Subunit: 273 residues, 5 copies
Amino acid sequence: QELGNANFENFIGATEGFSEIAYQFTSHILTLGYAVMLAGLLYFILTIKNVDKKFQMSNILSAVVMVSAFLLLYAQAQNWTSSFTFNEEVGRYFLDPSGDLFNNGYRYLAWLIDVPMLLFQILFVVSLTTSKFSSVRNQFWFSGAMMIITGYIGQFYEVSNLTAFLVWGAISSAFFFHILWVMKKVINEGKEGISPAGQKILSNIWILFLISWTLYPGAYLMPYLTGVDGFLYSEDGVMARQLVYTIADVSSKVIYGVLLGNLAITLSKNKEL
Amino acid sequence: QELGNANFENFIGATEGFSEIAYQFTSHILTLGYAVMLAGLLYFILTIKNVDKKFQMSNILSAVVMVSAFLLLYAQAQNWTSSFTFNEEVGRYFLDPSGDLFNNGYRYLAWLIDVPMLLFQILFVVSLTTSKFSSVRNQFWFSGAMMIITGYIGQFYEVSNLTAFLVWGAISSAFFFHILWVMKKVINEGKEGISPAGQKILSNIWILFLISWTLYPGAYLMPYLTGVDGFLYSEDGVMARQLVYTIADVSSKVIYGVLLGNLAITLSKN
Amino acid sequence: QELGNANFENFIGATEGFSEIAYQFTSHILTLGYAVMLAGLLYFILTIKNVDKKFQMSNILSAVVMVSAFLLLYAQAQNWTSSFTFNEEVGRYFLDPSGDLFNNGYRYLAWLIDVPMLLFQILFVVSLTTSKFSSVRNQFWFSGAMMIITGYIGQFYEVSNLTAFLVWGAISSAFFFHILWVMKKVINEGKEGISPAGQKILSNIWILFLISWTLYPGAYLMPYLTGVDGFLYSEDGVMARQLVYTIADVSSKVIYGVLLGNLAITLS
Amino acid sequence: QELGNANFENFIGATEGFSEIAYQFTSHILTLGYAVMLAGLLYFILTIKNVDKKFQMSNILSAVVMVSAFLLLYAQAQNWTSSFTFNEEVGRYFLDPSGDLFNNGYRYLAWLIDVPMLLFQILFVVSLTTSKFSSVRNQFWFSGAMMIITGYIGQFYEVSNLTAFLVWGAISSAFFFHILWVMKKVINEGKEGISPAGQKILSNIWILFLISWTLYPGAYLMPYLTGVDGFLYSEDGVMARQLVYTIADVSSKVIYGVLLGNLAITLSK
Amino acid sequence: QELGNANFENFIGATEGFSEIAYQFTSHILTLGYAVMLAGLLYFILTIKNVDKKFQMSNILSAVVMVSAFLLLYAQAQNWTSSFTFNEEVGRYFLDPSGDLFNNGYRYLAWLIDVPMLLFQILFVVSLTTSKFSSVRNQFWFSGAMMIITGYIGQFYEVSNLTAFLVWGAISSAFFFHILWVMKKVINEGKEGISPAGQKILSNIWILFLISWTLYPGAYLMPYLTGVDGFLYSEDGVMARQLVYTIADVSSKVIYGVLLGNLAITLSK
Ligand SMILES: *C/C=C(C)/C=C/C=C(C)/C=C/C1=C(C)CCCC1(C)C
Ligand SMILES: *C/C=C(C)/C=C/C=C(C)/C=C/C1=C(C)CCCC1(C)C
Ligand SMILES: *C/C=C(C)/C=C/C=C(C)/C=C/C1=C(C)CCCC1(C)C
Ligand SMILES: *C/C=C(C)/C=C/C=C(C)/C=C/C1=C(C)CCCC1(C)C
Ligand SMILES: *C/C=C(C)/C=C/C=C(C)/C=C/C1=C(C)CCCC1(C)C
Ligand SMILES: CCCCCCCC/C=C\CCCCCCCC(=O)O
Ligand SMILES: CCCCCCCC/C=C\CCCCCCCC(=O)O
Ligand SMILES: CCCCCCCCCCCCCCCCCCCC
Ligand SMILES: CCCCCCCCO[C@@H]1O[C@H](CO)[C@@H](O)[C@H](O)[C@H]1O
Ligand SMILES: CCCCCCCCO[C@@H]1O[C@H](CO)[C@@H](O)[C@H](O)[C@H]1O
Ligand SMILES: CCCCCCCCO[C@@H]1O[C@H](CO)[C@@H](O)[C@H](O)[C@H]1O
Ligand SMILES: CCCCCCCCO[C@@H]1O[C@H](CO)[C@@H](O)[C@H](O)[C@H]1O
Ligand SMILES: CCCCCCCCO[C@@H]1O[C@H](CO)[C@@H](O)[C@H](O)[C@H]1O
Ligand code: NA
Ligand code: NA
Ligand code: NA
Ligand code: NA
Ligand code: NA
């Protein structure tokens, strides 16, 4: 069947189809996804006044990211259940083109909000030393945009053109490495002149940032992580991808925002929690 | 009909179908479910300033749980009405696979939010004595996660593989017993150094916690609580399961959060 | 055809069908219903700080009831338009079982929130004298639950089994009479030791409570209030039922909550 | 094609059908409608503390009206797109009875909230002189209810029974004239004892009130304003009706509420 | 197939259809659109108290615009996915008339809120010198309305009548030039009496305003920017149009509102 430049979920759904567990779990994990984000939105708004005025922009930017993540994860949850329909004869869920093909591209364009804001918000909690605020922000935003746009293009070809998929993925990775480099500097400078408690939290933020952000390229490659005709090029890979995205999203956005909020509390003159 | 690793609601819906009462009630009880949660969300936000600053995180976490519960119970209410469609000839609601099979798994993964937050929030009202905050939190979260994940896997097999269903259910129960054990300690230490009024509320919280949380494994086993081909392996069992879930949800989340709020008030200097 | 234990709306919709006016009005009155509740929600939140801290719980509980009523009335509005579809040949709206049968049961289980909270909230404005707070609350909640659950069961049989319908309805009425009795006591004790202004408002609250709450059993019996094959056992009865529910809901929840808020202001 | 006691939009949609422009515009104007109301809701909440406590009830009642108007205009926007479906052969949108017949009745019952609250809220900004607060409120509410209910009944017959349509419309107009009379008194008394700036705003409120409220009976009669088989008894009349409703709604609710808010500011210490 | 006075997206969708990338991207960019607006709504509400009371109306008006933009961009995102359906045989998305024809007109009527409020809100941050507040406001609102209404009419003819399309577009452009002229005056007077930092921000606001607002007529002409049977009269042009709209919307509404907020902060004591 002719699917063109479509995500591998559609090829699995169109040929093998999805078992009850594969279809239900993907739906459940996406639902948890958007549930977490709307819960996070409420948390970040309600905890604004727990930190000094100077730090509250970080809470606001966390909230901004929650709204974006919620809307996108909600939309993507609906796209999943629309794109795959139960076949009574074989008892599996197959591609339902009437619901449109499933595409992860929704997530990517959403990142155009998330990435810039997540990178930006830490600069409202930590004080830079040697690096200039405007410089770090511009590097984050430029490399953030380029990372997303190049990855966005690549993922359309994840089945139709493995070469384009890997080249665009490679280019995207370059910009990612640059972001990791800059965020490392920001963490280091942020540690300078603050309590050991605040330094400990920034150490945790860096580990969280490194793992959670690396999961995204992992999700990108998921179908081919077990090579050609591998275990992962299947419904199991489809489940894995959306699980990894959901773990990444919760970690990179919510847990990240909570740690920043806790850092803001330690750096606050009035608050001591 | 080939349903695979599907919940028993789908087997009842596909064979016997659901009477008007069975279908309507299940829909009504799920609707009440999400209505209560969105009402609770408003209550917990509006009562934040009724307790001292240090206790307000408990109100916030209650609110967080309400958002999760509302979204999931709302989604599950829609999944119910999508999965079962009226047949004019026989006058019963039968499985409509076009709406997807009904699965309780939505609820389970939601618990990944609810359980950790419900267990966590009490540690913002009560003061521990001998137990370390970080230690209790880690035990709650680990055993909470494992309880849910193992139960989640099990419930897929509640018809297709009774053995897998019971083994995973058993493993889940172990983690549940651990949570009960730790929450007992937390309640006891919480009682130390507070007024009799506060101690009374914690006693109520423990009874509420014990009964409400035990209902979940009850809902898990519901179809087989009257044995093979029993009274409960029917639309009556389907009704019972969603009723028990709804009672459990209201009790474990809303009533729990209200009692914690009342405890916070007694512990408040204002 | 076989409808089983279904509400009479489905039998009218399946046999005679609904005229444009009957179908449209039922949809309009249900829409007004949920519109009023979401408007009320905003009113009750925005007026919280108009009364002393001790009374603000009443505003909060009003808000809680608005969220419940909005969600349920909204759902019920959608259920109405899903359950009845236009037939081009005859130009009437007939039962569309693909949308599910219409059931008022949604409203009933919602009352499990509304009734307990509406009864509870007055105990945050008025001071009891002889009656114990906990005692009144428990009586309200128990009799409230039993009234709803018994009525809920009964309304499933409003066509399929007139006997079960009337028996369950009768049992429900008993619990209702108990609630009326207890609320009367609460009003009387509430009047003791407060300004004439506060006493006037409580007098109004009692009249409102009595009429608005009595409309619900009226809506219950609506199809048979004109007896067998009566004027009301028709689309006109379907319209009447949802109108009475909507009047009752607005009165019992919104107007009630406003009067309590006004009482709270005089006592502040 | 038996439509019975249905609005004229359904007869146009069932016979001639709607051009792309007619169908799209009606959808766009209704969408703008509910967009304005939800935007207004946010405005009225966010500006509550811009006036003295005594005037803030007017902001709250504005908000209440916004919630009502938003919900109704949103529902009516969906009803429009559900009731008329594109026919590929002729390239026009025809009545799709599966979506239900289109009815303006949704709006009318909504007015049971809007009218009483809009009339009520001015009594929280202006001070009466001769007239008693309770008396004016009761007159507004009674005549408001009767105006809406009689008009609601009438509009069902706007095609099926022109006589019933005009009689009920006439009775409704009587109650409307009473409301205009009372609101005039309220404006006059409101002007007494306030700054010239406040008097100017009330003069604007009266002009706004008079024009915006008169548009509703205009929308009522729209199909027949060019007589039997006139230019307006067509998709152009359908467009006109919903445009007039939307202008009226924005004017009577949002602009009205803004002017009252501005009056409240001038009267604030 | 008879489409009449329909947008070119429908002609591309009805003839060649849309590739996976073209259909998915258009859907993604519209989704990003409304996501940004709802995120912006939260930002503008939460940052109200970051500026002095006198400037807070600008935050409120930013919020008002976010509500409008969110609702419309959300509706337009749904209209896109409703109007084009996958064909299994050829593996492309074709016009699905059952979902209604796609029309950008939704956006235009929304601008009736956005344009007046965006132009208005700057007058709550900057101080005019020689120009009268009321005069600037009236010029903005009149020319704003006329620009939108004339463009709205024109875009219905973008395929059916190229002449009407260009004439209405031309008339619209005249009103646009007037708005640019007035906003220039406002920027100049705004710079007078404020710190160099505030002047720098206003300079950026003017550049942002000029580029972002010019994108709209660009989106209008998009299908014909490569001439008849050009590269852009295709799915690539459809993608381009919605991309440009989304860049314009984010720039003209959100970034604009942020810069105004930053200006308000520098002007705050
Ligand atoms: C909440 C959203 C976040 C944190 C998004 C992060 C996105 C990435 C780190 C993406 C990285 C990618 C690569 C390094 C290669 C393949 C393409 C991407 C965009 C998935
Ligand atoms: C509001 C959500 C709550 C309190 C969830 C609680 C969940 C449980 C106590 C689950 C227990 C289970 C077992 C002990 C065995 C079977 C599987 C479970 C997960 C249902
Ligand atoms: C806003 C919800 C309210 C006030 C609900 C009130 C419900 C009743 C008073 C119900 C009464 C009934 C009977 C007395 C007999 C028939 C069954 C009932 C439940 C409708
Ligand atoms: C925002 C809602 C408002 C201001 C509603 C106003 C409604 C009217 C002024 C209605 C008047 C009518 C007549 C005078 C005759 C025909 C029937 C009516 C109800 C449309
Ligand atoms: C957020 C909404 C904004 C800023 C809207 C701006 C709209 C324009 C600048 C429109 C301009 C047009 C022309 C100059 C000619 C063609 C028609 C228009 C309306 C697109
Ligand atoms: C599976 C992940 C579930 C997480 C739920 C997300 C919604 C709520 C988010 C965070 C709540 C955690 C509260 C942390 C409190 C930190 C201590 C402090 O503030 O002093
Ligand atoms: C069969 C299932 C296998 C995978 C299950 C593993 C899930 C583990 C989940 C949660 C671990 C959380 C416990 C420790 C968290 C403490 C973090 C902190 O200190 O803030
Ligand atoms: C401080 C100035 C006081 C003015 C208050 C007037 C309220 C304005 C309402 C919103 C904007 C109205 C005009 C919008 C632009 C024109 C759109 C109409 C097209 C027919
Ligand atoms: C860094 C990760 C790159 C690994 C390269 C994986 C090569 C995958 O190879 C592809 O696998 C598909 C399904 O498995 C097959 O259908 C394709 O024919 C095949 O080209
Ligand atoms: C308390 C937990 C243990 C209960 C185990 C009950 C065993 C049920 O046994 C099962 O019952 C099904 C429905 O009746 C049948 O269809 C299955 O064939 C049968 O294996
Ligand atoms: C209010 C309590 C009195 C109820 C007694 C009314 C008896 C109605 O009787 C019923 O009327 C239905 C409607 O016409 C018929 O369809 C049934 O056949 C008939 O049993
Ligand atoms: C302002 C008061 C309006 C006067 C009544 C107008 C009389 C219209 O009369 C009606 O016009 C319809 C329009 O086509 C025709 O279809 C009807 O047959 C005709 O009765
Ligand atoms: C000033 C902006 C440039 C306007 C150039 C108008 C020329 C477009 O010309 C048009 O191109 C369409 C696309 O193929 C064709 O379908 C039409 O037949 C053709 O008239
Ligand atoms: Na599906
Ligand atoms: Na159903
Ligand atoms: Na219908
Ligand atoms: Na349509
Ligand atoms: Na589509």
